[PDB]
Amino acid sequence: AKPQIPKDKSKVAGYIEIPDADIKEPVYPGPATPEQLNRGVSFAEENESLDDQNISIAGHTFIDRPNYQFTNLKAAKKGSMVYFKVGNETRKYKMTSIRDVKPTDVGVLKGKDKQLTLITADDYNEKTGVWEKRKIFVATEVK
């Protein structure tokens, strides 16, 4: 009954939408490596589960194309609606105040309201397997 994330990294797992920022993107399986983000927005981790309290999704910030992936995500303010479609359901969330923040460099983020952590990523470092430039945007489940 539960929605599943494709084992084949090349298949679209879902759709993420953020109207205030004009973002509508097919979400692909993780981890979020250059190749996956080359296909499109993708789950940050290979382990991700659509049943987690926190689901992480990462996208590029390529300011050459204002509207490429999560480049314009900063245009989404508090209260902004976020839609995450996964086959059988459309989950709605609202952007909280935790947005456009350095990962644990300024903030921090169980038994808590389901949320979505959208991540803008750039500067991938092959030696460490880390995107060096990242901004966090947390949206909280509505219904």
From TrEMBL:
<dbReference type="GO" id="GO:0006508">
    <property type="term" value="P:proteolysis"/>
</dbReference>
<protein>
    <submittedName>
        <fullName>Sortase</fullName>
    </submittedName>
</protein>
<keyword id="KW-0788">Thiol protease</keyword>
<dbReference type="GO" id="GO:0005509">
    <property type="term" value="F:calcium ion binding"/>
</dbReference>
<feature type="active site" description="Acyl-thioester intermediate">
    <location>
        <position position="121"/>
    </location>
</feature>
<dbReference type="GO" id="GO:0042277">
    <property type="term" value="F:peptide binding"/>
</dbReference>
<feature type="active site" description="Proton donor/acceptor">
    <location>
        <position position="60"/>
    </location>
</feature>
<dbReference type="GO" id="GO:0030145">
    <property type="term" value="F:manganese ion binding"/>
</dbReference>
<keyword id="KW-0645">Protease</keyword>
<keyword id="KW-0378">Hydrolase</keyword>
<dbReference type="GO" id="GO:0000287">
    <property type="term" value="F:magnesium ion binding"/>
</dbReference>
<dbReference type="GO" id="GO:0004198">
    <property type="term" value="F:calcium-dependent cysteine-type endopeptidase activity"/>
</dbReference>
